[PDB]
Amino acid sequence: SQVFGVARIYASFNDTFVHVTDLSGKETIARVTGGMKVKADRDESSPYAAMLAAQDVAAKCKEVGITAVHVKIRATGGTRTKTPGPGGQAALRALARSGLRIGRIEDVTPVPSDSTRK
Amino acid sequence: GQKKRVVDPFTRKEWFDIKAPSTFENRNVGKTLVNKSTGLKSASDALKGRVVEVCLADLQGSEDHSFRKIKLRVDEVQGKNLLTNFHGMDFTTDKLRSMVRKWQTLIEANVTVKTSDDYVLRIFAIAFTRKQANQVKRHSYAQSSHIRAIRKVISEILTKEVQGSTLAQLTSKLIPEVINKEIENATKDIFPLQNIHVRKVKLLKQPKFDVGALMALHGEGSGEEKGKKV
RNA sequence: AGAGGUGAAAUUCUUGGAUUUAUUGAAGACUAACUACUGCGAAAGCAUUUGCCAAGGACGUUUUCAUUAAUCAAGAACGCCGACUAGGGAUCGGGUGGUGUUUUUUUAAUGACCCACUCGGCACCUUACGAGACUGGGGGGAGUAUGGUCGCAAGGCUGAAACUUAAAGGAAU
């Protein structure tokens, strides 16, 4: 009965991205980042900004007809921090609070597997 | 400068749903957007390249496949249905991070094998050295010649499990994790080896299309539809 | 319709679509977790697979030669101590024996673990007993005084001195 998108929450420091696409990932439904909701240019990563971004994400997903999302939560990864910023749990909580059902939370940050440091 | 005015792009979007191949259980996996089928980029060829990443638990009803996501590649569109075929397999990262422990060795192998079709697959394997029950030393390392011999028999018997399978036969073989049981039985002569897994299957080349083979993987179908009433 | 980034910012990119997402290609590196008071190497050092090329060490040996040996100035290649007793636990490589479980069978040989012994290693924790006799340098630590020598430093509204001199500024108000 549910229609499933995916969440693609990329929560670095300095910013968060709440970007629902379809089940493939080819077609996007309301990418809104954290720094476009309220910008003091340093509160972009804040839980308030992630809650605002996930809330109007869930507005447009209920508009299009998506009832549930599979959550893919990633950090900046690479040769860098690998820990999700303060916005990841806030964006997930606001997506669940704003009507969308949550399924399949998974951690898809890019572990660099022998990287390019030195 | 001047940027753009918006015109709502969800009025030109069309909903298809994805029918999985019949080497699985319940095969309606979800839906997919595409732009509306106009001339000059019809929607049925705006599709046909998309892979979707589904969970094998969602494809098989159970929860012991809660890891092991798979990829399904859209091949043929008919009647607002996307018929898919197998495109790959991958663990989640948390599964193999949950498997790796210090004071053991991980033997990992991979082989590039061409099946009984002309699909060529890079297929991987991981295995971790167990300790026996009554073992009192804390290490249980393999002596690296046991690693070379274990990796040798892993490569030989899983390249025997491919070439002796098609894609549908290999997929139905690696759903109930039984190539892992073949590796375990063939390798307990050398080292104990807890939790052998396949962990990753990549398509490299795919032969041709063969709509008949895809529709025999799914089921038949042909339409004479409605007629205009004037 | 912003993205980096910062303690905040900024240089930078961006409606000729940045960042995010999906598919794919190319490049140059690198070999994550496994990874250890573990291994190997003469040292610097060495971590993906498979193969080839030579090498090396320890062990096993009722094999062989028979003193062929040890140390280092010169030269060449690469780049709490000792001459000292016993131990103890753990670990790496080899060997012998035991006799249980994983293994298993008439295709080849080949494991893993447990225990005792033994040889050789990287360490660790202890014990007993010994004379162990890219070269150039003033003289302890913490301070104290200074009628010596060498320095640096004060004055006093600026303008403004030969001129009791303008404008403007300062200060106190």
Q: Tell me how far CA of residue A57 lies from CA of A60, A64, B5, B201, in angstroms.
A: 5, 11, 20, 34
Q: Decide if B34 touches A, using CB distance below 8 A.
A: yes
| Chain A: closest CA distance from residue B230 (Å) | 35
Q: How many C-alpha atoms does B26 have within 13 Å on its Cβ side? A: 8
Q: How many C-alpha atoms does B78 have within 13 Å on its Cβ side? A: 14
Range of the domain at A17: 1-118
Please give the tally of structural domains in chain A.
Answer: 1
Two tokens at A111?
Answer: 């572990």
Q: Decide if B27 touches A, using CB distance below 8 A.
A: no
**Residue B77, φ and ψ in degrees, nearest 5:** -100, 130
Query: What whole-number distance in Å separates Cα of residue B86 and Cα of residue B167?
Result: 7
Q: What is the CA radius of gyration of chain B?
A: 23
Helix (H, G, I), strand (E, B) or coil at A30: strand
Query: What whole-number distance in Å separates Cα of residue B23 and Cα of residue B199?
Result: 19
Query: What whole-number distance in Å separates Cα of residue B51 and Cα of residue B119?
Result: 17
Query: What whole-number distance in Å separates Cα of residue A56 and Cα of residue A19?
Result: 11
Q: Note the resolution in Å, 1 decimal.
A: 8.6
How many residues in total does chain A contain? Answer: 118
Q: What is the number of H-type helices and E-type strands within chain A?
A: 2, 6
Two tokens at B92?
Answer: 């989640």
**Ramachandran region, residue B198 (left: φ > 0; alpha: ψ -120 to 50; beta: rest):** alpha
Q: What is the CATH number of the domain that holds A89?
A: 3.30.420.80
**Residue B149, φ and ψ in degrees, nearest 5:** -75, -40
Strands B28-35 and B13-19: antiparallel
Q: Is the CB of B94 less than 8 angstroms away from the CB of A108?
A: no
Strands B69-77 and B13-19: unpaired
CB count in 10 Å sphere of residue B12: 11
**Domain range annotation of chain B:** 11-219
Query: What whole-number distance in Å separates Cα of residue A55 and Cα of residue A51?
Result: 6
Helix (H, G, I), strand (E, B) or coil at A33: strand
Two tokens at B182?
Answer: 């073949």
For residue B18, give the amino acid letter. I
CB count in 10 Å sphere of residue A27: 17
